[PDB]
Amino acid sequence: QISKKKKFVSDGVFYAELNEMLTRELAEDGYSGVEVRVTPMRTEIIIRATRTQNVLGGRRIRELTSVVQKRFNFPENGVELYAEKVVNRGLCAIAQAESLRYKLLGGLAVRRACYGVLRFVMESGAKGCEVIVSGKLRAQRAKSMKFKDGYMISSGQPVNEYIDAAVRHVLLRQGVLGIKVKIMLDWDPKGKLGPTTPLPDLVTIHPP
Amino acid sequence: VKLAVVVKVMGRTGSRGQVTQVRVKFLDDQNRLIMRNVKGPVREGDILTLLESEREARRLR
Amino acid sequence: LALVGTMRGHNDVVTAIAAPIDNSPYIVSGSRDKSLLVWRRLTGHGHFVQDVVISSDGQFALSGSWDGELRLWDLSTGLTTRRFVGHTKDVISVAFSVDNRQIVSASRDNTIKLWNTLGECKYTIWVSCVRFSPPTIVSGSWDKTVKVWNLTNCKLRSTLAGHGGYVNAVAVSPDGSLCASGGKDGVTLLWDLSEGKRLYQLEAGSIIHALCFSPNRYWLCAATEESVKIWDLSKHVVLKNQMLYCTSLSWSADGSTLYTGYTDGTIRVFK
Amino acid sequence: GDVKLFNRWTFEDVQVSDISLNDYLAVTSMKHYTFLPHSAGRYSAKRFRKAQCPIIERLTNSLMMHGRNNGKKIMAVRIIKHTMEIIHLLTDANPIQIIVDAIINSGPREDATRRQAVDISPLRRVNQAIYLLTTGARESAFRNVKTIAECLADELINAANSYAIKKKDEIERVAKAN
Amino acid sequence: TARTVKDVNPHEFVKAYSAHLKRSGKMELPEWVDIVKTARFKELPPSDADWYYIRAASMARKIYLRQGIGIGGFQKIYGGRQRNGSRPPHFCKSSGAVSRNILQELQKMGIIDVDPKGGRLITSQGRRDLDQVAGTV
Amino acid sequence: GTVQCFGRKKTAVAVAYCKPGRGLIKVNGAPIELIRPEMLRLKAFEPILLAGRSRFKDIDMRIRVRGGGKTSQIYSIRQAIAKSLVAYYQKYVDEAAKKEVKEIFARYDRTLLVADPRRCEPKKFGGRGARARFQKSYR
Amino acid sequence: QHRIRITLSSKSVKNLEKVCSDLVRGAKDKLLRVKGPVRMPTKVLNITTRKSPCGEGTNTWDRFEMRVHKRVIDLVSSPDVVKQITSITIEPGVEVEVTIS
RNA sequence: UUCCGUUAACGAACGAGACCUCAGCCUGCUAACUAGCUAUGCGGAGCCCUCCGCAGCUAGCUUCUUAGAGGGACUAUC
RNA sequence: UGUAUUCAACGAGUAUAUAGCCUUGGCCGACAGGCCCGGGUAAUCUUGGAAUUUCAUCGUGAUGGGGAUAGAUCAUUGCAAUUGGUCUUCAACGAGGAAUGCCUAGUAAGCGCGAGUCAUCACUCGCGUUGACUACGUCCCUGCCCUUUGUACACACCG
Ligand SMILES: [K+]
Ligand SMILES: [K+]
Ligand SMILES: [K+]
Ligand SMILES: [Mg+2]
Ligand SMILES: [Mg+2]
Ligand SMILES: [Mg+2]
Ligand SMILES: [Mg+2]
Ligand SMILES: [Mg+2]
Ligand SMILES: [Mg+2]
Ligand SMILES: [Mg+2]
Ligand SMILES: [Mg+2]
Ligand SMILES: [Mg+2]
């Protein structure tokens, strides 16, 4: 049989492969991650999307369920795959990443597209946002242009759970434009908004 | 050969700060106070030997 | 009142000094030095012990540590006869029962706990030092009030709210007929257990660590920070690092001596 | 007393003929005198900490040179034991006394820096003496019939006419000319 | 009342027990005593003419100290530094056929035996001999 | 009297198990007098040669040492015997004798009762040694 | 009868600890002796790699490091009750294996 | 650019700090047959005692190794 | 150089086809290498895990330091020759000019081990062992930062 180390590596690279495969197919719907669990006799793989009414089309979901069953040599009647709706479209980094990609590809000016995305993320309720676009916008020379506001931490352990970041390489007519979106999440003790723990610099006081 | 006891340290001086200028008094004659310089590590309360007891010094050399 | 001697065998604050009822020379000092002493050494805990006592037979020592547990110890062998675990917050004080069969403990968990010395039945009801009545139980609270319970059904008997400062400990008469408090206000309140009403006041000035009632002299010794003060029950004081504070007072069974638990281990005996 | 160097050498006989280098040498027979010069103690932490270290420790630690010899303190203390036996058996005296005499006769007094001449720290004096003795023994031991213990013994007695005394002579000559 | 392998130092023990094997006169010798090097990393074969008996005493003590070691284990413990010239030094093993042979002779003397656990174990008579020779120190 | 005392130095631990008897001293089942190398042997007779055999004339000592190097093991036993002899009186005899032997050992050397915490720190990338780096050639 | 060994493999300490306490208490519900929990030595996977896609620039290596935590439980009981106890819900990141012991 | 203060500035964002990992101490707790410590019983040699190996489905324990919750240091006292 | 004491951590290790990995043990072989019994998909099995340290031949000699370089020879890896065994050969080299780099405590320095590389062949990343001298100061040089000041520089003094 297969040792634990090789199996763990195999599931890790398999999840990465699943993410890459799904992110390059749901461009019309905004793929926003996946949750994979292993229940007795069942392997559940639930896809996330900002737009879910179009993922269902539910026959196509059954085809994509057979996709992992037969491509990865998974056993039949042991793998399930459904689609799910984002709790908050704005608070999701990749959601606004490909949203900005679609907005700039459609024909909107990039500046206006990032202003719209920036207003939408504060509509969601983000502590702060940052959008960085690098490359050639109109001229031959490439430039880096940023729009940031709100709370924007930059260092330490809290950077890897109190922020959500996404990077994309949109193929434009004249080249490839690099987009990055970073969103700060507030302290939600329940954990539905962002992290379940407060920041080290955030301290609350009970009145006497 | 006039043994002297370091009485106070006036901070490291010199180009590299290697020499340390101190004030000393003689064990044979306590009341005489001179200024000299010493290489190496020197702390207060130590006893230091010399050869020529007539050389003087300057403050913050 | 005169100096008997000085002790220097401790490296931290000694918090409780306990002496056997039988007046036997096997007293136990429980300290926040992570160590106890017998006048035998105890180190079975892993935190700072606060309150220590001695069983009625005088051959056992019960001590509770700030880690949030209690231990009754075989004095001769220096080993734990039994543990008592379940005080999530740090314990503050211990005491025995009228028959010395139940152990009452007060901790930082805003609650008091009664434990069986051998039985598995335990019950619960910042509570400061407690001292059972030799049968109600008196206790200090976190709102400048002193509560008195009922041992019949573990119910609250009454509350005494006349203290201007917090209550750090409680004092009971040797015959179980008096109650006394003290704290930052410096005025020690004396009440009667029976009616549960305010009898009178004594003026000290600051925090009193331990309030010890004289078993024979019917007196009251208080470890005031400014100066240890002794009253006779005429309400008149008829005792003296830049910071100097005691930690505990202990009345001897004979009545002609007293033992103090200090900060830097200078345990002092008066006679 | 009950503490003797290798259970053989008695420390309660050795004094220092100077009142300027007393505290920097651990030779007093009340403390700081050990069974052997090998100890896993920390002495570079704070300033003047090595003064409390035994003199024999300093002598045995200054021999682990060159780069093919460091990390071999065992050979160092074995060689110091051999040279100690040589010194005691020849001179018929306490080898601690010979070590102290060599150190106290091998320390330069004045240097010249910045060029102006000025004195030397006593801790630097003993340190320079020990370094000079170890380097002289190494010089006399390289490409020669002699082993380490023999040249160490010869340099120790000759410094109580020698390499270390001539190095101090030339250093003091350079100093006293400015 | 008794000195045991623990109570007497390994150096004098192995030399005395090599002398014991010397005047024992029971175990055989190969035809290659001087020529073969005990390890390939070694350059000069053991200059001691009676190196074989010293080696056999080393085995006699080793099997007393620890049991269950095979031919590879003894090949490992008798390894050492191999300097490859201008290349950095490394670790190397020892000879195997000579160790296999001497272990076989020690079986022929009854000092050891094969085990189900892999390797060899000391027999009671051999460790008895080691015990009394330790007592004779 | 049977107590456990662990003497730790670098990565060498000497576990000493006490038992009453006639003062037999054994390390790893081998006599203390056969400590190798013999020239560092006096390093491990410090507690016996300082406290004295009269202190341990009635209780034996049996120690097993694991890990570290040779010198680290020697220091491990050096501190393990000291800890075990403090535990000799701390748990089985009295307070005054244990206190005085602890004070005498401390006044001889601090390491006898305090474990030195110096450990090997991890080696940093970009260099040969843990703290040293390569040879910088600009051109 | 027919002792059963369950192995709990994960990468997160909190999930493994909570599920181990839950399973042990569930076994204690049926008044069953449990020898454990046994905290298997954690195994570390260390990998070092050069950040620069092309070797230009000073050589800087990142050091990815993963931890694998494991617990083991032995229950002296019929396997059916073990399956009943483990049939309850699970949290992500923890893998359950059952064997006859 | 850490703070106290001074102050035509006031109130704030990053960076630093805060954060996280590992090591350093715990005879405190949790609990270990894929890890150990001790005693005993058996066998091995010179009853006991020195001594090596094997069991005791609990001889007992986690001091020794493992891994977890925790504590410990905060410059508090001089 | 030759005997003989002996103390670590990190990690890694199978498709079972006879068997691709780690290999235990037995046998054969001087060594290199080959056959059989098998274990471990792993805290179980590998995993029982060097400098140093008693003893001696050297003996100051480019010498038993050193082994560059060569020839003869065997076998492993690989489809196909890389490496490793034996003997013989025994070059420069006797602390290195101007310049020059790293480092303040279990650190430097010395010695090995594992992994990556891999059908075969070890520099880089970690691991451990022995274990010190000095310094604990300074801006002298090489820089960095701030304040004042000067400027005909602003591609900014390589102006
Ligand atoms: K070897
Ligand atoms: K027996
Ligand atoms: K050559
Ligand atoms: Mg911050
Ligand atoms: Mg930081
Ligand atoms: Mg333990
Ligand atoms: Mg802490
Ligand atoms: Mg050798
Ligand atoms: Mg070892
Ligand atoms: Mg040579
Ligand atoms: Mg050569
Ligand atoms: Mg390469």
Side-chain angles (χ1 to χ4, degrees), chain A residues 1-5 7-208, chain B, chain C residues 1-7 9-225 227-271, chain D, chain E, chain F residues 1-56 58-139, chain G:
Chain A
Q1 38 101 352
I2 288 314
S3 78
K4 324 149 191 153
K5 308 256 206 118
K7 174 68 127 167
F8 266 48
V9 163
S10 199
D11 305 37
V13 306
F14 140 75
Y15 145 89
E17 166 48 54
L18 212 161
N19 283 35
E20 190 45 57
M21 176 217 282
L22 265 291
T23 196
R24 67 170 66 248
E25 194 272 315
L26 292 165
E28 81 289 318
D29 267 25
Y31 169 73
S32 49
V34 59
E35 161 64 49
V36 179
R37 273 284 83 221
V38 277
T39 38
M41 212 36 258
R42 319 292 336 177
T43 40
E44 162 61 45
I45 293 99
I46 170 76
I47 301 297
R48 312 200 50 71
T50 286
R51 155 161 268 164
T52 306
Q53 78 264 43
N54 197 1
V55 183
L56 191 126
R59 162 195 62 249
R60 327 317 307 212
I61 319 182
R62 101 169 164 194
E63 164 146 343
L64 294 187
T65 321
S66 189
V67 155
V68 283
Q69 182 255 359
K70 73 107 178 195
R71 143 86 185 88
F72 300 125
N73 314 337
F74 277 179
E76 190 41 83
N77 239 29
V79 58
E80 318 87 62
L81 167 136
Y82 324 124
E84 250 201 281
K85 180 69 142 285
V86 296
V87 186
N88 184 300
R89 159 207 38 243
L91 269 203
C92 168
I94 198 174
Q96 302 325 99
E98 80 260 347
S99 200
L100 181 66
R101 181 254 298 285
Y102 185 18
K103 212 150 203 218
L104 64 93
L105 253 172
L108 201 44
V110 49
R111 304 72 191 171
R112 289 181 303 214
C114 328
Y115 314 139
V117 163
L118 214 171
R119 207 191 143 152
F120 258 111
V121 277
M122 320 315 188
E123 161 267 342
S124 55
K127 258 186 89 170
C129 172
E130 173 175 20
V131 164
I132 295 168
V133 175
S134 43
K136 34 146 59 186
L137 319 169
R138 251 196 47 186
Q140 314 159 16
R141 295 300 300 276
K143 69 221 104 167
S144 61
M145 68 138 56
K146 320 160 171 226
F147 327 115
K148 70 167 311 302
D149 41 2
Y151 284 89
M152 201 55 267
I153 215 75
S154 310
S155 78
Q157 178 38 230
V159 81
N160 53 249
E161 107 289 18
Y162 249 90
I163 89 177
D164 278 344
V167 49
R168 195 61 33 65
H169 297 44
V170 49
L171 156 61
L172 208 60
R173 145 82 196 81
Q174 209 41 267
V176 155
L177 205 42
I179 71 98
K180 298 159 200 45
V181 47
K182 309 180 46 179
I183 289 121
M184 201 138 297
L185 304 321
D186 80 43
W187 180 28
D188 209 299
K190 313 151 191 94
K192 64 143 296 307
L193 198 142
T196 82
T197 181
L199 273 164
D201 294 335
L202 264 288
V203 169
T204 173
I205 312 282
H206 325 307
Chain B
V1 194
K2 269 61 80 174
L3 303 213
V5 46
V6 188
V7 170
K8 204 46 80 180
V9 75
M10 281 315 78
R12 333 287 309 266
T13 70
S15 60
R16 319 281 214 287
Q18 73 273 46
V19 315
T20 312
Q21 148 202 330
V22 313
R23 66 148 165 166
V24 297
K25 75 202 152 203
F26 301 169
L27 276 296
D28 41 272
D29 200 23
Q30 308 295 140
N31 79 350
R32 204 189 172 204
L33 311 162
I34 331 300
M35 199 138 274
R36 301 265 282 214
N37 329 303
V38 191
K39 341 283 203 187
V42 165
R43 57 180 156 168
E44 287 323 308
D46 297 350
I47 321 294
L48 257 169
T49 194
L50 55 90
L51 273 205
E52 309 141 355
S53 45
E54 181 48 41
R55 309 186 310 204
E56 314 142 21
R58 323 201 232 258
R59 188 62 44 91
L60 275 179
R61 267 182 167 227
Chain C
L1 319 158
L3 162 74
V4 178
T6 38
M7 290 283 138
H10 301 150
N11 283 316
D12 214 353
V13 152
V14 282
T15 53
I17 285 187
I21 289 302
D22 313 298
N23 199 100
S24 276
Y26 257 125
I27 83 163
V28 179
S29 88
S31 174
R32 71 160 312 156
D33 197 24
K34 259 187 260 176
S35 61
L36 271 75
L37 253 200
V38 168
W39 315 88
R40 307 310 310 280
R41 198 139 49 242
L42 289 170
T43 168
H45 306 252
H47 281 72
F48 279 3
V49 187
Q50 232 296 335
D51 189 14
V52 78
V53 279
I54 282 168
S55 276
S56 78
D57 39 302
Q59 298 273 335
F60 287 136
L62 173 79
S63 83
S65 149
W66 263 332
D67 54 356
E69 56 93 4
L70 309 156
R71 282 186 202 227
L72 207 151
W73 299 89
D74 212 350
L75 183 136
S76 308
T77 76
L79 307 182
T80 323
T81 53
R82 206 192 206 200
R83 273 183 93 207
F84 310 95
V85 279
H87 272 291
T88 39
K89 276 89 173 185
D90 317 333
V91 311
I92 298 176
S93 56
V94 306
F96 279 109
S97 211
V98 53
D99 57 345
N100 307 80
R101 206 74 266 188
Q102 313 280 72
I103 286 163
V104 49
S105 34
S107 161
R108 280 162 209 187
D109 41 21
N110 314 120
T111 39
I112 314 103
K113 211 154 186 312
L114 54 144
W115 278 65
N116 297 9
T117 318
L118 274 158
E120 218 264 335
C121 155
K122 332 293 179 177
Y123 194 77
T124 206
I125 46 183
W126 293 359
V127 278
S128 75
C129 268
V130 307
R131 264 161 51 171
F132 69 101
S133 61
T136 190
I137 302 91
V138 311
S139 66
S141 163
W142 60 99
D143 54 352
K144 318 159 171 167
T145 61
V146 167
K147 270 187 198 267
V148 279
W149 249 263
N150 278 314
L151 200 37
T152 87
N153 52 341
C154 293
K155 93 163 264 277
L156 177 65
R157 194 188 70 149
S158 276
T159 305
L160 312 163
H163 215 52
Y166 40 68
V167 195
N168 51 273
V170 291
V172 200
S173 180
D175 64 344
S177 68
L178 275 83
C179 205
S181 76
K184 85 185 136 204
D185 45 62
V187 47
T188 45
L189 307 178
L190 213 78
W191 325 281
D192 198 348
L193 272 176
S194 54
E195 72 258 31
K197 274 309 318 173
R198 320 183 186 188
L199 292 184
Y200 41 99
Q201 286 56 245
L202 321 167
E203 298 163 347
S206 179
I207 296 160
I208 288 109
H209 311 75
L211 306 89
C212 47
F213 277 38
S214 284
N216 189 23
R217 280 83 58 239
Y218 208 67
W219 281 6
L220 200 174
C221 209
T224 324
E225 325 273 348
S227 279
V228 166
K229 266 162 265 258
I230 169 76
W231 289 270
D232 57 296
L233 322 179
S234 74
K235 305 181 216 165
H236 173 7
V237 192
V238 172
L239 256 288
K240 274 322 281 173
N241 260 338
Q242 283 181 329
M243 280 141 246
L244 329 167
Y245 326 108
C246 194
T247 322
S248 50
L249 298 177
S250 202
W251 269 129
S252 180
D254 48 43
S256 34
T257 56
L258 173 146
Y259 325 111
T260 83
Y262 205 57
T263 48
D264 43 358
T266 83
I267 279 176
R268 305 186 207 125
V269 182
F270 313 142
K271 78 164 54 142
Chain D
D2 267 316
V3 165
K4 304 162 37 57
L5 189 60
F6 330 128
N7 310 24
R8 160 72 164 278
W9 313 122
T10 58
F11 291 80
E12 44 265 36
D13 84 301
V14 163
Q15 71 284 347
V16 164
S17 67
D18 208 299
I19 67 192
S20 36
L21 298 93
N22 204 37
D23 61 318
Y24 315 99
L25 328 174
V27 289
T28 81
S29 324
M30 287 268 94
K31 54 202 72 197
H32 307 348
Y33 65 114
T34 65
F35 285 26
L36 69 147
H38 186 259
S39 62
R42 182 92 313 161
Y43 327 111
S44 44
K46 218 63 182 283
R47 198 175 184 121
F48 315 115
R49 170 147 275 288
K50 44 187 186 195
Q52 325 311 107
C53 195
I55 275 294
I56 188 42
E57 295 235 346
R58 312 244 307 182
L59 245 199
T60 203
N61 264 327
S62 310
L63 154 79
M64 317 199 313
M65 290 154 218
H66 279 347
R68 61 171 204 164
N69 281 338
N70 32 62
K72 312 219 177 115
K73 212 171 159 184
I74 301 311
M75 299 293 277
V77 52
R78 167 206 82 145
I79 281 306
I80 217 76
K81 275 192 61 183
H82 288 325
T83 198
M84 182 145 268
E85 171 144 21
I86 296 160
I87 289 323
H88 165 68
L89 262 280
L90 185 140
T91 45
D92 295 30
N94 189 13
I96 292 332
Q97 193 49 65
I98 288 98
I99 301 269
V100 172
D101 266 330
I103 295 166
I104 202 57
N105 300 23
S106 38
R109 257 164 315 261
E110 282 83 40
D111 300 334
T113 70
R114 178 164 205 299
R115 288 305 297 275
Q116 195 172 112
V118 87
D119 282 62
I120 278 177
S121 193
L123 194 36
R124 200 199 196 279
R125 198 161 105 80
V126 48
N127 230 310
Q128 179 122 45
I130 299 204
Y131 146 82
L132 231 47
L133 281 159
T134 38
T135 48
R138 194 147 302 109
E139 203 83 79
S140 300
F142 174 74
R143 265 312 290 166
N144 214 37
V145 158
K146 306 308 283 145
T147 82
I148 307 330
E150 295 133 13
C151 43
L152 260 182
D154 160 79
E155 203 54 29
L156 259 285
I157 48 184
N158 249 317
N161 65 290
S162 93
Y163 182 89
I165 198 62
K166 103 198 178 183
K167 279 299 193 160
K168 163 181 150 171
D169 165 39
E170 50 211 62
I171 294 165
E172 194 137 85
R173 205 209 38 80
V174 173
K176 72 186 174 44
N178 233 315
Chain E
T1 180
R3 272 126 310 286
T4 283
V5 186
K6 52 143 198 284
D7 220 43
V8 282
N9 62 75
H11 274 117
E12 297 153 349
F13 216 160
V14 299
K15 74 189 50 178
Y17 211 54
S18 60
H20 156 290
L21 197 39
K22 183 53 53 73
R23 85 301 181 271
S24 93
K26 291 167 299 147
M27 70 78 88
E28 86 218 348
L29 272 311
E31 82 303 320
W32 64 20
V33 181
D34 164 39
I35 167 75
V36 300
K37 334 202 267 194
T38 326
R40 62 206 173 83
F41 72 80
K42 301 208 149 251
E43 161 56 80
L44 157 67
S47 179
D48 186 67
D50 54 284
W51 70 249
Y52 194 110
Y53 274 20
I54 326 304
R55 191 53 73 106
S58 205
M59 260 48 44
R61 193 173 94 84
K62 282 322 204 150
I63 313 149
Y64 194 110
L65 303 152
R66 33 190 294 212
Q67 303 65 0
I69 318 107
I71 308 292
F74 292 62
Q75 190 145 39
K76 154 213 92 171
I77 167 180
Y78 301 132
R81 269 289 182 273
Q82 179 190 76
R83 317 169 21 194
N84 278 46
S86 265
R87 289 310 109 185
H90 271 280
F91 217 99
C92 176
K93 52 157 51 146
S94 197
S95 171
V98 314
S99 44
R100 211 178 62 253
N101 154 283
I102 178 52
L103 298 215
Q104 276 162 341
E105 331 200 35
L106 300 155
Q107 318 181 266
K108 297 152 200 137
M109 210 187 267
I111 218 158
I112 60 164
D113 55 9
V114 197
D115 54 349
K117 320 297 190 316
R120 326 278 178 195
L121 330 168
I122 194 135
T123 62
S124 194
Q125 52 272 37
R127 48 133 299 291
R128 180 62 210 91
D129 160 45
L130 205 43
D131 188 88
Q132 44 75 20
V133 76
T136 58
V137 167
Chain F
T2 64
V3 284
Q4 275 323 75
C5 263
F6 44 91
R8 171 165 320 109
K9 193 262 195 179
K10 285 204 204 195
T11 317
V13 177
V15 184
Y17 171 69
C18 156
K19 33 173 54 166
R22 51 225 71 199
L24 192 37
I25 320 295
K26 291 290 154 271
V27 308
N28 291 287
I32 190 96
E33 29 171 359
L34 282 81
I35 274 161
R36 89 203 323 136
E38 320 203 353
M39 71 76 87
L40 295 108
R41 195 170 275 147
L42 286 193
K43 274 295 269 282
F45 306 355
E46 161 46 10
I48 315 109
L49 201 43
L50 182 122
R53 323 192 308 239
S54 99
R55 302 304 275 146
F56 330 119
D58 320 312
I59 330 182
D60 321 87
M61 211 79 255
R62 184 202 77 220
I63 308 94
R64 33 223 181 274
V65 197
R66 205 272 338 160
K70 303 179 172 196
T71 75
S72 62
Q73 283 193 167
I74 276 300
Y75 278 102
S76 79
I77 173 63
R78 170 168 171 259
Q79 81 147 274
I81 170 184
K83 298 172 62 90
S84 34
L85 50 97
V86 201
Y88 261 20
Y89 314 140
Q90 167 54 77
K91 322 293 194 313
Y92 227 70
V93 178
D94 77 82
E95 302 146 11
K98 167 246 176 180
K99 277 154 154 170
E100 61 76 13
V101 53
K102 149 195 42 167
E103 304 285 345
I104 293 187
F105 276 39
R107 81 155 267 287
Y108 165 78
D109 155 46
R110 279 200 324 116
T111 279
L112 254 63
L113 281 293
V114 154
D116 180 275
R118 292 169 310 186
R119 305 292 99 77
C120 272
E121 93 295 22
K123 163 214 176 267
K124 322 301 159 325
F125 87 116
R128 183 73 75 208
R131 272 226 204 158
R133 306 299 115 176
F134 302 119
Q135 175 170 11
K136 197 156 162 162
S137 63
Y138 308 119
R139 295 300 140 166
Chain G
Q1 281 265 14
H2 214 54
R3 342 203 292 187
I4 281 308
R5 198 159 273 212
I6 202 166
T7 76
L8 282 193
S9 94
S10 100
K11 319 179 59 142
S12 58
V13 189
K14 293 322 279 201
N15 307 52
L16 246 200
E17 271 222 345
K18 69 101 148 166
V19 76
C20 194
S21 41
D22 163 38
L23 192 84
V24 173
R25 293 316 117 191
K28 297 315 271 193
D29 174 24
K30 318 303 197 193
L31 269 307
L32 262 171
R33 141 147 176 195
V34 160
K35 204 88 186 290
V38 190
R39 308 206 187 233
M40 202 56 188
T42 77
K43 38 214 302 185
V44 175
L45 316 94
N46 41 269
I47 285 92
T48 321
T49 187
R50 166 67 150 283
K51 187 266 186 194
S52 95
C54 178
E56 200 274 347
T58 324
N59 321 321
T60 279
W61 299 49
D62 75 61
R63 193 211 51 113
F64 304 122
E65 183 267 302
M66 293 67 58
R67 325 212 181 231
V68 174
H69 301 268
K70 184 182 321 213
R71 311 267 188 259
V72 284
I73 277 304
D74 197 273
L75 174 57
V76 280
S77 87
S78 86
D80 195 41
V81 80
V82 189
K83 316 150 189 162
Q84 150 181 26
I85 295 168
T86 183
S87 56
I88 80 162
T89 190
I90 209 75
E91 75 281 349
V94 162
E95 330 299 306
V96 283
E97 273 67 63
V98 285
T99 38
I100 288 77
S101 65

